[PDB]
């Protein structure tokens, strides 16, 4: 065996068994461990190693489950994982019925927080340890936030109010300089000048037996510390858990620790493909995303137009924003994990006569209802939100699955809602939206889309939808992923209508009046919830105009979805092909039978 | 005239026309002004005398509209009104036709951003002046952020990245130690103590310096705007400021009623609001529940807390203007087997509709939310209205709704939710109802609605505001149904399928917006059953609605009781 250290280890009892001189050992398993887990491609390798020392260190001197370890983002704690009897179950992470990618609390009992949005541990944190005083309890709580997360506003926020509070606590900054893209902020360009202190050997200890950069914060500032020193973590740890008052840990570690490849390039090593740990090669993505798309279309439309600026929370890359960055240097930025400052800032460059494009997946979107409801809508601001992993996203999951967009934007008075069904009808809604008064959102999932040529830039009506199959007896309406499932299901269904309905806000008044007036029966579908979605909208709109056809809505059910592909996710919700042929058959369509 | 400085001030150019020995008195003419504006109750007089100096200072230094000068929340800027041509029109302010009671980028080129909620203004100016670098233009661009506002997470991050940026802005924190409670936060504590509190933010701070001195301000704004790099000028004013009554208590002239200038007696109101409702029966309900755990994000006041907070010391949390902390804090003290309350306005759980959402609801925890001020609040206007609560939470899975008729009702509700698994959601107006005995805990069962008046013909459903106006429209009509529809997350879909099955038409009512809310709940839940009865869905159309009194909104939304009748009558009912 390769992990005779490991191989012993069932959990964090079992770990304590260790001399604190095998633990430099340890962590070179885990690390050889977490990369052969990884090798299969689709997970968070760089984050994981770059924490292999800090979450050994913790679980070595805390005694969780009664000590609590929270994990922001929790995408860092693949070693937790393995320390806490899951080192088998790493085989089938985020996979359906396997692990969750994040720590999950119906999961483990070492799980402390469900997390996957970032910057929710200091707030989770300081909840527990108030609930922790009020009830009389004497345990630990303990936090892991990594720099990136930090430039969250409710993480700021958080920190204003532990420091206030003054409880127990300890605070673990795990700081790499790294977010996905390098991080960005103040504070991460202030605290790379601040220098490394040495602890343990112990030049630091003698010291104490040189500026906070929270002073306002009223907290116990200690470090930066090495945060691959295994030992002298455990020995900082077992000084700072027992004071009164809450403290930060700073920890500077790099981003792949233990891997040359990943550290070299921690960008792309954050979440890689299939590759060989031998060699560091990986299976490229040959395949041309709607984020490409996305990408090519505005970099393009920059070109001509100086008025377009191109806002992103800490996503340059998911978002497909690498070219643009570096066309349009003068035209984008990155505001960090911080949803709601890029909205709002988007609204003070439209306010000055810019036109903004924020570039938000829709999971995180929802960081930033109030600030487009509030700082956008009222004004009816020139604000285009592109918004990419609309719908499932599959593996990542329930706190990850973009499936709220279309519910909570379309009661915001003034904000127009488009789904495209190609990259040609996505030009048409950007060239759209960037030249017309008020807010605009583009939704499209995580996927793949044909590439068009440049200069493809059509006129399109906002608002009217497009019959795409024939029909008067039963018709779908649906847009995006679902128009591509809809389409599939009826394509040897003569009579049974498609129309692209591209439109959520507004919908097509005219057409929807004329097709619910003559078809017996219409079926809407919708990558979103069912709950007050595009299906509801069409509800609303037809008890308006007084039409009853009979309507099955098909959408994601009223249910968190768990980790699993989209396809699997959209067969059980019941809005895949063969669903929607299901469903047609229940409405008297003579569809074929399989026998 | 007692104001012969301020009759020539029609705007910032005339005010540039005094000598700077003149502004002293200038702004003594504003605060006597401001004082006599507000003396007929209901605006926000103590934090707008406060900046009376700050703001003269900045009109005089810079050059607006060329120059954009943004308020935060926009509540202090009163005075900056009176010097930007509107001085007549405060007379009217709040009034429905009149202009609003914060700075809106619609009533006037002087305004820079349309503010209600706090925190807004650093990521505003952050887009303006990387706007204005991106044009090649040259104007200035300056905030004004309270204390309070600063304690929000959007305006610290926004503040980080302003560091990172480094383009020229001035931030001015008018710092007065007050939120609308004594403000909260580490901040706050550090402040009242040669350091630069934002030295991590890479931004320049002056500080802190007299926010009353208006001549000095003026000095320091000339050697200030022009600097390169983001800059902090930290003043201290005092809430109030001009008025004794005010400066003894910031807390009551935050917003005081009609009051007499001369004596500082003002007119007590003795109504029994739903916030003095929730406030006793929480501070109730914790006496014999040790797990229940009140969250406020800077609204004790508001709330109706201020006896809670007494009484129960150790079972309050003020998380200052962070809505976001509220709800997550409250989330892990769920986690650790705590029954926490976040008592929070709806227009202000908008701020955390990711923490509902990611942090209590996708591990279904007992946080309890009870939301005042939802539906129609009036003089407040678009930025405050909560009429979007029932669309985006019933959106989230596991989140339950309620409407309390009364206060027995929210009683039973509290208790529902405070002994049952899951988040839950209890939704109020601004109002008053009637106090009810100590001990009042009904038990109800959560998910049934009530029938109120018998009637098949015609039958309304409708909960909490919007029930009262359904019970005075089928007053003297016979054969139209009421439901008290207390419940929108679970409907009662029984009792609707028995409704939608045997009447002609149904009405829904709701203080709400008509989208994805309570109306589009029962059309969802109708179609599901194959049930298609005649349904007029009313509530407020999807338009954001300007400063009025709430009865006059809801008389042009159609939801008070002479439009019920109206569509009454439209649906076939004999209508005397
Ligand atoms: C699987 O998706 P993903 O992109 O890898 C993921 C886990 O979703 C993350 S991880 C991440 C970077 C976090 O940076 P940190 O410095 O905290 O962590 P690290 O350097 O990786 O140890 C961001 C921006 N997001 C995206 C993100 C953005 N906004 C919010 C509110 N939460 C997020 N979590
Ligand atoms: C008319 O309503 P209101 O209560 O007086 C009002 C204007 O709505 C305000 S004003 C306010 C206090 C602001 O404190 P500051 O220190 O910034 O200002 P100040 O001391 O008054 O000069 C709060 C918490 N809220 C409430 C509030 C809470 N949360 C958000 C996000 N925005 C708010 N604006
Ligand atoms: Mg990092
Ligand atoms: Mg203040
Ligand atoms: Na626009
Ligand atoms: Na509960």
Avoid at 302 to 310: H, Q, S
Avoid at 426 to 440: C, E, I, N, S, V
Avoid at 487 to 505: Q, S, Y
Wanted: charged content about 20%; aromatic content about 6%.
């Amino acid at each position: 065996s390769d992990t005779p250290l490991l191989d012993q280890i069932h959990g964090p009892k079992d770990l304590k068994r260790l001399s604190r001189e095998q633990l430099p050992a340890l962590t070179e398993e885990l690390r050889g461990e977490i990369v052969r887990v990884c090798s299969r491609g689709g997970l968070h390798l760089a984050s994981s190693l770059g924490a292999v020392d800090i979450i050994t260190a913790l679980h070595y001197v805390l005694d969780s489950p009664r000590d609590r370890i929270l994990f922001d983002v929790g995408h860092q704690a693949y070693a937790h994982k393995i320390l806490t009897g899951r080192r088998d179950q790493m085989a089938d992470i985020k996979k359906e019925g396997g692990i969750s990618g994040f720590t999950k609390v119906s999961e483990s009992e070492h799980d402390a927080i469900t997390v996957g949005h970032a910057s929710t541990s200091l707030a989770n944190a300081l909840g527990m340890a108030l609930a922790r005083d009020a009830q009389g309890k004497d345990f630990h709580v303990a936090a892991v936030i990594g720099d990136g997360s930090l430039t969250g506003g409710m993480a700021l926020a958080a920190l204003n109010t532990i420091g206030d509070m003054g409880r127990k606590m300890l605070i673990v900054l795990n700081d790499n300089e790294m977010s996905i893209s390098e991080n960005v902020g103040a504070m991460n360009k202030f605290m790379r000048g601040l220098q490394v202190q040495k602890w343990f050997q112990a030049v630091e200890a003698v010291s104490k037996p040189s500026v906070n950069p929270f002073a306002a914060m009223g907290v116990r500032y200690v470090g930066p510390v090495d945060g691959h020193n295994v030992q002298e973590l455990v020995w900082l740890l077992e000084r700072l858990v027992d004071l009164d008052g809450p403290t930060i840990l700073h920890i500077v570690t790099t981003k792949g620790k233990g891997l040359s490849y990943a550290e070299a390039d921690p960008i792309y090593w954050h979440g890689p493909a299939k590759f060989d740990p031998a060699t560091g090669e990986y299976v490229p993505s040959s395949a041309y995303s709607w984020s490409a798309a996305f990408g090519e279309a505005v970099t393009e439309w920059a070109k001509t137009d100086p008025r377009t600026f191109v806002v992103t929370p800490a996503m340059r890359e998911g978002s497909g924003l690498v070219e643009f960055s570096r066309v349009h240097p003068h035209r984008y930025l990155d505001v960090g994990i911080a949803e709601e400052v890029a909205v709002t800032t988007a609204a003070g460059m439209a306010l000055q006569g810019m036109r903004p494009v924020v570039a938000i997946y829709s999971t995180f979107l929802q960081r930033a209802y109030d600030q487009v409801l509030h700082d956008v809508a009222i004004e009816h601001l020139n604000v285009t939100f592109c918004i990419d992993r609309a719908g499932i996203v599959g593996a990542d999951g329930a706190t990850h699955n973009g499936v709220f967009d279309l519910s909570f934007l379309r009661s915001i008075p003034g904000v127009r809602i488009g789904l495209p069904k190609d990259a040609a009808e996505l030009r048409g809604m950007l060239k759209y939206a960037q030249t017309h008064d008020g807010p605009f959102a583009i939704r499209y999932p995580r996927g793949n889309t044909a590439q068009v040529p440049a200069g493809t830039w059509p006129d399109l009506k906002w608002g009217e939808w497009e019959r795409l199959k024939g029909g008067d007896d039963v018709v779908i309406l649906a847009g995006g992923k679902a128009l591509d499932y809809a389409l599939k299901a009826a394509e040897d269904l003569p009579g049974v209508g498609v129309v692209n309905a591209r439109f959520v806000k507004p919908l097509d008044e005219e057409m929807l009046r004329e097709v619910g007036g003559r078809a017996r029966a219409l079926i809407t579908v919708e990558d979103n919830t069912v709950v007050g979605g595009f299906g509801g909208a069409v509800l609303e709109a037809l008890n308006s105009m007084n039409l009853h056809p009979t309507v099955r809505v098909l959408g994601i059910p009223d249910e968190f979805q768990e980790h699993a592909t989209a396809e699997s996710v959209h067969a059980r919700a019941g809005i895949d092909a063969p669903a929607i042929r299901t469903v047609l058959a229940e409405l008297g369509v003579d569809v074929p039978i399989e026998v």
